Amino acid sequence: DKLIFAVDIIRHGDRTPIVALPTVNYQWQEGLGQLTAEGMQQEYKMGVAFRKKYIEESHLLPEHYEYGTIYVRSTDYARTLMSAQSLLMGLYPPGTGPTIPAGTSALPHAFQPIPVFSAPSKYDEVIIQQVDRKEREKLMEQYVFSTREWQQKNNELKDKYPLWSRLTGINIDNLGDLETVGHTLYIHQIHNAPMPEGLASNDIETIINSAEWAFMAQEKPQQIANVYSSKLMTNIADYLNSGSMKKSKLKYVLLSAHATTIASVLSFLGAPLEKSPPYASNVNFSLYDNGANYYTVKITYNGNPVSIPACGGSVCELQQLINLVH
């Protein structure tokens, strides 16, 4: 069994919060929504593991970056572009960069430039499907807000939304409003950033564990995942199909996505996540040739086999995967 193509959806590394809490004065040094140094090392080390897997152990890619062989597309965010640059620095590190005729390295420490292509979210033909605000609310009310367990979570904390709106500073009427706050509190935890004064230790975990839950409840439904990840899955499907033909120089596609991208894909494959994708997460698609024209795709999420119902496990036949997309 030979590795003849691979697709990596990754998440960006450790980041600053999107919103500041209006009752905490905390200057985030890196800015809002920005890759932290920790995040740069998280992605770099996932790059080294990729090097070991794709170049040392398999030979799927050469030792030094070659034209035609890899494609890297990011979303229209600083943090995914910078996560992508960090990771490729691990995949093709300094020492492997090109050199001028005379013989000395073209860039300091012989770093290797690799292009990270990208499009605005509204013009993205590869990763992101735009969906109108009004139409997501239509979907969200139908497949999620509707559900027994959404209702019951809301109902458990349908009275502390007053106390938390005051202490948080950003007002909370329903669980959806709570998601955005809990994620910011989670990041405050990781970086030892100050919490809203008066907010109980016990209430912190609640808002965090509730924010994760609610975020994941909105990816779980396959109907949602189909609207949001069809384009992306049609594209990965086609990449793998063209990989199987063994004509094209192209062996590897790296997509610099986020948590939603990863959770929407797995939910699409009928393996929705209970837990949030960590920083530096990857869904991986490995195309194997058995030498007898039996093309298999092994899908893994942070190293663990994903079990696709439509394939009865982590191994899909190539056409089984294309069918499941269609």
Which residues contact a second copy (rule: CB under 8 A)? 29-31, 34-38, 40-41, 44, 67-68, 76-78, 81-82, 85-86, 89, 93-94, 98-101, 106-109, 111, 113-120, 123, 125
Residue 215 engages ligand AMP in binding (rule: CB under 6 A): yes
Residue 259 engages ligand AMP in binding (rule: CB under 6 A): yes
Nearest to 214 by CA among 167, 262, 181, 165: 181
Q: Which does residue 254 bind out of ligand AMP, a second copy, none, counting CB within 5 to 8 angstroms by kind?
A: none
Residue 276 engages ligand AMP in binding (rule: CB under 6 A): yes
* Residue 18 or 310 with smaller CB distance to a second copy: 18
Residues linked to residue 239 through DSSP beta bridges, in sequence order:
none
SS3 (DSSP) at 320:
helix
Cα-based distances in Å from 10 to 74, 193, 199, 282: 10, 26, 34, 4
Q: Annotation-wise, does 188 bind a ligand?
A: no
Q: Annotation-wise, does 179 bind a ligand?
A: yes
CB of 281 to ligand AMP, least distance (A): 9
* Residue 76 or 205 with smaller CB distance to a second copy: 76
Q: Is 139 exposed, middle or buried (0-12, 13-18, 19+ CB in 10 A)?
A: middle
- The maximal CA–CA distance of the chain, rounded, in angstroms, is 73
Q: Which residue is nearest to ligand AMP (CB)?
A: 258
As a whole number of angstroms, the distance between CA 132 and CA 258 comes to: 20
* Residue 211 or 287 with smaller CB distance to ligand AMP: 211
Q: Which does residue 76 bind out of a second copy, ligand AMP, none, counting CB within 5 to 8 angstroms by kind?
A: a second copy
Q: Annotation-wise, does 12 bind a ligand?
A: yes
CB of 194 to a second copy, least distance (A): 16
Residue 34 engages ligand AMP in binding (rule: CB under 6 A): no
Residue 258 engages ligand AMP in binding (rule: CB under 6 A): yes
Q: Which does residue 205 bind out of a second copy, ligand AMP, none, counting CB within 5 to 8 angstroms by kind?
A: none
Structure token digits, residue 109: 């420490």
Residues contributing to the annotated binding site for AMP: 11-12, 15, 79, 179, 183, 215, 258
Residues contributing to the annotated binding site: 11-12, 15, 79, 179, 183, 215, 258
What residues make contact with ligand AMP under the rule CB under 6 A?
A: 11-12, 15, 18, 179, 182-183, 186, 211-212, 215, 258-260, 276
